[PDB]
Design a protein around this ligand. Structure first.
Ligand SMILES: CCCCCCCCCCCC(=O)OC[C@H](COP(=O)(O)OCC[N+](C)(C)C)OC(=O)CCCCCCCCCCC
Ligand SMILES: CCCCCCCCCCCC(=O)OC[C@H](COP(=O)(O)OCC[N+](C)(C)C)OC(=O)CCCCCCCCCCC
Ligand SMILES: CCCCCCCCCCCC(=O)OC[C@H](COP(=O)(O)OCC[N+](C)(C)C)OC(=O)CCCCCCCCCCC
Ligand SMILES: CCCCCCCCCCCC(=O)OC[C@H](COP(=O)(O)OCC[N+](C)(C)C)OC(=O)CCCCCCCCCCC
Ligand SMILES: CCCCCCCCCCCC(=O)OC[C@H](COP(=O)(O)OCC[N+](C)(C)C)OC(=O)CCCCCCCCCCC
Ligand SMILES: CCCCCCCCCCCC(=O)OC[C@H](COP(=O)(O)OCC[N+](C)(C)C)OC(=O)CCCCCCCCCCC
Ligand SMILES: CCCCCCCCCCCC(=O)OC[C@H](COP(=O)(O)OCC[N+](C)(C)C)OC(=O)CCCCCCCCCCC
Ligand SMILES: CCCCCCCCCCCC(=O)OC[C@H](COP(=O)(O)OCC[N+](C)(C)C)OC(=O)CCCCCCCCCCC
Ligand SMILES: CCCCCCCCCC(=O)OC[C@H](COP(=O)(O)OCC[N+](C)(C)C)OC(=O)CCCCCCCCC
Ligand SMILES: CCCCCCCCCC(=O)OC[C@H](COP(=O)(O)OCC[N+](C)(C)C)OC(=O)CCCCCCCCC
Ligand SMILES: CCCCCCCCCC(=O)OC[C@H](COP(=O)(O)OCC[N+](C)(C)C)OC(=O)CCCCCCCCC
Ligand SMILES: CCCCCCCCCC(=O)OC[C@H](COP(=O)(O)OCC[N+](C)(C)C)OC(=O)CCCCCCCCC
Ligand SMILES: CCCCCC(=O)OC[C@H](COP(=O)(O)OCC[N+](C)(C)C)OC(=O)CCCCC
Ligand SMILES: CCCCCC(=O)OC[C@H](COP(=O)(O)OCC[N+](C)(C)C)OC(=O)CCCCC
Ligand SMILES: CCCCCC(=O)OC[C@H](COP(=O)(O)OCC[N+](C)(C)C)OC(=O)CCCCC
Ligand SMILES: CCCCCC(=O)OC[C@H](COP(=O)(O)OCC[N+](C)(C)C)OC(=O)CCCCC
Ligand SMILES: CCCCCCCCCC
Ligand SMILES: CCCCCCCCCC
Ligand SMILES: [Cu+2]
Ligand SMILES: [Cu+2]
Ligand SMILES: [Cu+2]
Lengths: 241, 382, 236, 123, 236, 51, 52
């Protein structure tokens, strides 16, 4: 089997690195598929990064994989970085595509096609789970924090793009001018699902209301995907397919 | 470049682009090229295409080889989507700034909220120079001039790298110890309750508190700097001013229209009644980005794309001047290789074999009348 | 010996081939690859499609058949050291599968997004899809099937039964390839737009979730690793 | 019948229900339109009907009056601006094959439940 | 004796009655049966509705009550030959139920479709529905309930408990009859059309699925058949 | 509106763009019957072979 | 215009005027295809006798 204690430790370390690679990149592929086909459109364009739809949708659909991977990793190994590894893998895949295809293949500027930041929410989810190991407490409080910290976490990046500009007689933010200038042949302006105002939009509340709705739906989605990951962690064998 | 694939009948009856003009054919980096013209919204708008209640004047190009400096529909700038009325004629104007060297097929297109892209004629525009010379300066209402090519790039890179480093630090701190198999065995064999002990909990508390504090302080700092911000400006723009074209003095009734399968020609019979007080002559038939011209009546001098222009592609059985008040029936054949190159012959595959187009009648003085025709298009095989 | 240098080749073959594919599509994306009815498109991308489909079918047949033919009949009389070696080989196969899954489901799929926002769709066989739907997806399908077959035919833990998490991890991502039918149907009949978050794309999302069965698969491989060569060291 | 035969033979050979749900359902979805083409092909001969192009089937629907079934109720292919080339039938067939995989997978377990032999002590 | 000629009557009664019903509706479909407010419609179809509803209620009461009253109290002391005879009788009942289910859920329901594409709907009591919703559906409901009661009261296998597949097979198709409320509500408020595939009709679809419990019911009857008279021959 | 005569006298001739005149009352009926009967016979043969 | 500024119980106050529908109707507001002429008041402190 194994020769000695030292060689067993070395073998276990090699297994650790290889399995970490396997987990990380399978998660990168699957999570990137899910993210880009559930929130990728807002993640592609700064003029899509708004206060209502982007803030509402991104945490809700992005808390899926962290919940499942947490429910597996913490339960089976006491490893409190399922959310962090999910978010980091998504960010790495997104950034590789943005740099080598969005800016490499086509020539959209990086300050126009940068992705959103999710590490603060992932860190909250992981720490709130390790401390007070309760999965219910995580689903209620950590998912709340994940939903709430999204927009403040991304504000230092997108704030300079919201400086008002008088552009040929019309008021536009810098992000609006970016979307106008850099032509997306397949993405006309009306496709932009952004905050457009309603007659029931009271005062200055679009971003906080969206953040709290996202936090509540993040509680719900975390609760569902905890059990989804529980099922995906099964070790059953089938006698016949 | 995305046309020649859309249904021929859809291309024939969505939007008719005419009076198109391009300011330049070859430009240097940072130079401006202006595309002008008129587009007419067809009355018989296809039912599976939503009415252009929300439409966007777009540019068909392979990515940002140009930047859209300005675009106008009716003289006023249209950075957002607009509402167009079926049957109205609008004049447009698009200003492009050269950004990437190369030969680019620039199309003027319209995107509809429920029908997808309506691509107009495309013209090859050459860009010369280097992409490194391109500049996109913008002056903000706060009194600073920034270059949109690299504005905020360093800040974005810094923040993303910082948060990535924080996540990597968390994972690496937990990855210094053995990871998978010993921990799995410890959790399995009895209570684990040994793999997570202080100061691991202290490190987690520190990470959580530091993350929340850093987010709050970064938001506050980004509030102090850039104290004036506005939300993304969006919303469909109503009240697009259409052109007030005079009522045409030529009435044309289409009595059957046929095309050979296979073939490169389309034949139709027209009863033209000339009202007003000037002898007219049919000079052009435009169906879908393809202009069939009668060289004896009209010649193109606006630099229309050669692949879409048929200089002598329009033949009229009796193209003698039509006296005012006189009505006559003629056989009109529109034949060009473009009819097959742009797959207008693929209308046989379409579930609605109907065509629409524009006829241009010119008098002796040279002033022209635009009359619009549409009819079923019947293939002929025998 | 145990873990040998097959891991380096497993990483390098995918990296080099996909870097060459990226170079090829960066060269022939525009300029014979924008217009789907030009003759040059047929020679530079339709020929690519035909060649890659034939090569994928042939490679899948050869690899799966060889793995199934060389299957271990006498799995009972297998030494623990050889079991450890085979477990490491299966881990190499899983590493290759993870790398292929990354390249297929992240890189070329979000690259399909760049193309599905920059140019007007002209056909169901644009360069982006050909490189993704018909090259990278079949490649990772082949790798996953090969890993499953190797586990079943060499590892006694994965023999005497079909592992449910392994089957889900191997087949669910495969279901994305027939899901291309929904993508094309949902782009021509549904949704006259280029919205990347449209419900026409939730088919990839649904079957992208099934890659989360890698967790059950990996704990099964950990148990297979820790059958005889579990210790000692660990848990002592 | 061709789709049914494919489903049954692909199931008996390689008794795997998963293999059936993937391959036999693919064939069931794909062979539908080619299986029906010899019947409906003569009805697609073009006809010039009072100045409008109509297939024979269109003329049948026009002539034989369905009082309760007006023309607009007809959910048929009407063309879009994203319909590229000659691909309506194959794209529909492949979408049907994929969704047939999904529906076969669901209804296999539905039938598994319907085959139960449980007894209830009280309704 | 075993299987006797009750099977011939079970087939013939349904065939003859439904052939006469088809003749009646072919004669009075038009010509007193198009206009729902004409006096002749009241005498030729409303009277039909009233008579059939009363007769169905009376027949259901009589049949179910007789079957429940003549129930076998001493099921323990039942010879295997008599059990085989009763199993064959229950199979005859199931044959009658299948024939009635065919006539109700296929013939007259797709016939309701002919009418719901050829003439403008005038009421909730057109001839087609009267013949289907209030005649054929109650007839097969009566037959199914009678078969279930006979099984429970004569077959020891189906006694000492309510069979779940049998209950589903008997009740789910019954649920189509109260589902007529959704049909009429979904035709007057929803869907100003005659689309036969409208979601207003998925109620029949949902409860038409429950007839698939015939598979569990039939394997239960096979086990009841093969209790004492299983062999030998079979499996030897 | 009163209609007199016999339904057997009704004709619905149609001339196609391929140059053939067909009666819409019975055009393609034989082909439809043949193909449906053939496929039904194939299915019945399968079931009977197993039966 | 308002007929009265101070009224007793059961007395009538009449509100008249003109309203113009803006041509540039905002896109997130549906066109007034179905509109109701309402009265903004804290509950039924008045009863709407008539509205034209
Ligand atoms: C430390 C203990 C005391 C503080 C406790 C918090 C009280 C509220 C503070 C408001 C601050 C502010 O800025 O107001 C709120 C600002 C608007 O402000 P405005 O434009 O001035 O609105 C003028 C009108 N007012 C004077 C009435 C505010 O946005 C919002 O509408 C945010 C609305 C969020 C709705 C969803 C909440 C879900 C909670 C879930 C709990 C589990
Ligand atoms: C563990 C949980 C940690 C959560 C950390 C929260 C950081 C605080 C951010 C300040 C928000 C702000 O400053 O105002 C709200 C702004 C929106 O502003 P805007 O509409 O874009 O205006 C643009 C002009 N700016 C730049 C001045 C804004 O941001 C948000 O919409 C996010 C709102 C979430 C805050 C909820 C906190 C309530 C306590 C949680 C109780 C259970
Ligand atoms: C379990 C629930 C516990 C509640 C704890 C609340 C702590 C609040 C901390 C300060 C946040 C702050 O000051 O920021 C809140 C911001 C204000 O946004 P703003 O005015 O648009 O702009 C920024 C203006 N600044 C820069 C001055 C902040 O966002 C919001 O509008 C959210 C406010 C509504 C919160 C409703 C919570 C209801 C709780 C009910 C408990 C019974
Ligand atoms: C899981 C099993 C996968 C099976 C599918 C594999 C697909 C392979 C590519 C199809 C090419 C095609 O079809 O095109 C054939 C191309 C067309 O280019 P050309 O016009 O000749 O220009 C000159 C050729 N350049 C433009 C490439 C320089 O030419 C060729 O002969 C060269 C194809 C080389 C492919 C092998 C190298 C791969 C990278 C090295 C690490 C492995
Ligand atoms: C597991 C996947 C294995 C793939 C095996 C493919 C074998 C093809 C057999 C010939 C069919 C044929 O020739 O017919 C296909 C017809 C062509 O239709 P048409 O041009 O409109 O008209 C008829 C013209 N004829 C009469 C000349 C045929 O339908 C289609 O458009 C479907 C074509 C797209 C198929 C995409 C498959 C992608 C596979 C990816 C593998 C990695
Ligand atoms: C035997 C091995 C080699 C062949 C492998 C198959 C390659 C493709 C053959 C195309 C033949 C043809 O006819 O093209 C396809 C015809 C259109 O043709 P067109 O009008 O000329 O299009 C002009 C533009 N082009 C030149 C780029 C084609 O319909 C189609 O769009 C069918 C699209 C089907 C989409 C869904 C596929 C799902 C696959 C799922 C796998 C599990
Ligand atoms: C076990 C699986 C068996 C499948 C048997 C398939 C028989 C081949 C039929 C030829 C199709 C054709 O000829 O072209 C496509 C035509 C559509 O043509 P149309 O638009 O009606 O044009 C009218 C003019 N016609 C009459 C010339 C057509 O039919 C179809 O849309 C069905 C497309 C399904 C073919 C998929 C096969 C790809 C291989 C499967 C890989 C995993
Ligand atoms: C599960 C329990 C089912 C219970 C419901 C049974 C419904 C029976 C039909 C209702 C009739 C009604 O209501 O109409 C009464 C009709 C009205 O026709 P008329 O104007 O008198 O013309 C003359 C009669 N012809 C038009 C029928 C010739 O006349 C009758 O008296 C005759 C009704 C005969 C019904 C019995 C024969 C059935 C076929 C033989 C095999 C069983
Ligand atoms: C009624 C609901 C109110 C909120 C309480 C929900 C928390 C329940 C979680 C739970 O089930 O217990 C798990 C751990 C058990 O650890 P113990 O060994 O009990 O540690 C006690 C000492 N401590 C106070 C530092 C924790 O205990 C903890 O989870 C941590 C307890 C400290 C509360 C703050 C932790 C959360 C930080 C965000
Ligand atoms: C997206 C939602 C999740 C999809 C998967 C659902 C799984 C539900 C459970 C299931 O299918 O049951 C397994 C059986 C086949 O295995 P069996 O022969 O029952 O295995 C016998 C041993 N055992 C009793 C310990 C299990 O099932 C069968 O009868 C055959 C079908 C097998 C499907 C599972 C493999 C899917 C791979 C992607
Ligand atoms: C990795 C996925 C690649 C595809 C393989 C999926 C098939 C798996 C089905 C399965 O679980 O095994 C059931 C039978 C077992 O029969 P065996 O007794 O193994 O017969 C072997 C001899 N044979 C090659 C003629 C079959 O074996 C078969 O199912 C038939 C095996 C022959 C393959 C072709 C059959 C399908 C025809 C369409
Ligand atoms: C369309 C979706 C399927 C619908 C049917 C779902 C069936 C779910 C299971 C179920 O209902 O449980 C049965 C119990 C009543 O029987 P029990 O008294 O639990 O039987 C005792 C013996 N047993 C433990 C071996 C079962 O349930 C009850 O508590 C009473 C309700 C019985 C419903 C089943 C009969 C439906 C006939 C159509
Ligand atoms: C972990 C995924 C790495 C993806 C990197 C990639 O797509 O590389 C292509 C891109 C192409 O840009 P560039 O390097 O400038 O070379 C251009 C060549 N073409 C146009 C053929 C891609 O940059 C490189 O080739 C850098 C090599 C990285 C090795 C891991
Ligand atoms: C899990 C959430 C699914 C929600 C579906 C959705 O967002 O659909 C939007 C679409 C509304 O169409 P719209 O967004 O207006 O599409 C505009 C573009 N066209 C008109 C070309 C489709 O509704 C449907 O057509 C029904 C979807 C059924 C889902 C099982
Ligand atoms: C397995 C279901 C059989 C359904 C047959 C049917 O509906 O028959 C009525 C139809 C009526 O057409 P026809 O025979 O011309 O007689 C017309 C009499 N009316 C108008 C009352 C139906 O044809 C017959 O009566 C043939 C006898 C078949 C016995 C199984
Ligand atoms: C399992 C799929 C159910 C999909 C439902 C559907 O197709 O509904 C179409 C209908 C759209 O109405 P439409 O087809 O335009 O009806 C035209 C005729 N009128 C206006 C008279 C109803 O949508 C609804 O009203 C909501 C249906 C809720 C289902 C639980
Ligand atoms: C919607 C979430 C349902 C997840 C299914 C988990 C089933 C576990 C059974 C062991
Ligand atoms: C949607 C398909 C669910 C089928 C239910 C089967 C449950 C079986 C439990 C024994
Ligand atoms: Cu072009
Ligand atoms: Cu026009
Ligand atoms: Cu006004």
């Amino acid at each position: 089997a194994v020769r000695s204690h030292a060689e067993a430790v070395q073998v276990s370390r090699t297994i650790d690195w290889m399995a970490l690679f396997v987990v990380f990149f399978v998660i990168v592929g699957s999570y990137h598929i899910h993210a880009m086909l559930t929130m990728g459109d807002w993640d592609f364009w700064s003029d899509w990064k708004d206060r209502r739809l982007w803030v509402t949708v991104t945490p809700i659909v992005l808390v899926t994989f962290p919940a499942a991977v947490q429910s597996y990793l913490w339960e089976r190994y006491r490893l409190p970085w399922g959310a962090t590894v999910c978010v980091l893998g998504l960010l790495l895949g997104e950034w590789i595509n943005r740099y080598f295809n969005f800016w490499g293949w086509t020539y959209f500027p990086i300050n126009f096609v940068f992705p959103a930041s999710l590490v603060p929410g992932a860190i909250i989810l992981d720490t709130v789970l390790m401390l007070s190991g309760s999965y219910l407490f995580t689903a209620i409080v950590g998912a709340m924090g994940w939903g709430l910290i999204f927009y403040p976490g991304n504000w230092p990046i997108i704030a300079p793009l919201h400086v008002p500009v008088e552009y040929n007689g019309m008021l536009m933010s810098i992000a609006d001018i970016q979307g106008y200038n850099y032509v997306r042949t397949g993405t006309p302006e009306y496709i932009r699902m952004v905050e457009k105002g309603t007659l029931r939009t009271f005062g200055k509340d679009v971003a906080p209301v969206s953040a709290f709705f996202s936090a509540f739906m993040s509680i719900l989605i975390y609760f569902m995907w905890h059990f989804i990951g529980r099922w995906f962690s099964n070790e059953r064998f089938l006698q016949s397919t | 470049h995305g046309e020649k694939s859309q249904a021929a009948f859809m291309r024939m009856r969505t939007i008719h682009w005419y009076d198109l003009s391009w300011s330049k054919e070859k430009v240097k980096i940072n130079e401006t090229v202006e595309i002008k013209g008129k587009f007419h919204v067809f009355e018989g708008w296809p039912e599976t295409v939503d009415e252009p209640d929300v439409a966007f004047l777009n540019v068909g190009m392979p990515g940002p080889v140009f930047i859209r400096k300005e675009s106008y529909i009716g003289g006023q700038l249209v950075p957002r989507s607009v509402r167009l009325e079926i049957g109205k004629t609008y004049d447009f104007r698009v200003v492009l700034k050269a950004r990437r060297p190369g030969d680019w097929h620039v199309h003027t297109m319209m995107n509809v909220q429920g029908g997808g892209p309506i691509i107009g004629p495309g013209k090859w525009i050459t860009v010369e120079g280097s992409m490194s010379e391109f500049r996109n300066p913008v002056t903000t209402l706060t009194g600073q001039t920034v270059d949109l090519e690299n504005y905020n790039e360093g800040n974005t890179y810094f923040w993303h790298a910082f948060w990535f480093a924080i996540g990597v630090a968390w994972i690496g701190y937990w990855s210094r110890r053995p990871i998978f198999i010993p921990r799995l065995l410890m959790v399995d064999a009895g209570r684990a309750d040994e793999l997570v002990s202080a100061t691991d909990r202290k490190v987690a508390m520190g990470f959580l508190a530091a993350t929340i504090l850093i987010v709050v302080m970064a938001m506050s700092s980004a509030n102090s700097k850039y104290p004036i911000t506005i939300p993304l400006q969006a919303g469909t723009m109503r009240g697009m001013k259409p052109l007030e074209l005079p009522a045409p003095t030529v009435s044309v009734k289409v009595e059957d229209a046929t095309y050979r399968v296979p073939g490169r020609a389309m034949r139709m019979k027209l009863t033209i009644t000339n009202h007003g007080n000037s002898p007219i002559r049919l000079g052009e038939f435009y169906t879908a980005s393809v202009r069939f011209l009668d060289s004896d009546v009209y010649k193109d001098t606006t630099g229309y794309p050669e692949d879409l222009l048929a200089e002598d592609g329009l033949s009229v059985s009796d193209n003698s001047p039509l006296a005012p008040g006189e009505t006559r029936t003629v056989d009109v054949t529109a034949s060009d290789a473009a009819w097959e190159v742009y797959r207008l012959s693929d209308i046989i595959y379409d579930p609605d074999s109907r065509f629409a187009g524009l006829l241009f009648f010119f008098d002796a003085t040279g002033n022209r009348q635009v009359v619009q025709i549409d009819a079923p298009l019947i293939p002929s095989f025998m | 010996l145990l873990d040998k240098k097959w891991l380096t080749f497993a990483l390098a073959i995918y990296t080099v081939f996909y870097l060459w594919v990226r170079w090829y599509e960066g060269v022939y994306g525009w300029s014979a690859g924008l217009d789907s009815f030009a003759p040059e498109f047929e020679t530079y991308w339709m020929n690519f499609l035909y060649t890659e489909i034939v090569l994928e079918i042939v490679t899948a047949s050869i690899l799966w058949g060889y793995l199934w033919k060389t299957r271990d009949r006498n799995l009972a009389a297998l030494t623990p050291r050889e079991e450890l070696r085979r477990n490491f080989t299966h881990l190499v196969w899983l590493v290759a599968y993870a790398w292929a899954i990354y390249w297929g489901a992240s890189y070329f799929t979000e690259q399909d997004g760049t193309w599905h926002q920059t140019i007007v769709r002209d056909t169901d066989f644009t360069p982006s899809h050909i490189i993704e739907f018909y090259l990278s997806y079949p490649i990772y399908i082949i790798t996953g099937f090969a890993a499953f077959i190797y586990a079943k035919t060499r590892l006694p833990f994965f023999a005497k039964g079909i592992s449910l998490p392994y089957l889900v991890l191997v087949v669910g991502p495969f279901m994305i390839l027939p899901n291309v039918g929904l993508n094309e149907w949902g782009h021509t009949f549904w949704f006259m737009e280029e919205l990347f978050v449209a419900p026409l794309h939730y088919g990839f999302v649904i079957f992208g979730w099934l890659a989360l069965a890698v967790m059950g698969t990996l704990t099964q491989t950990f148990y297979s690793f820790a059958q005889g060569g579990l210790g000692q060291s660990l848990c002592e």
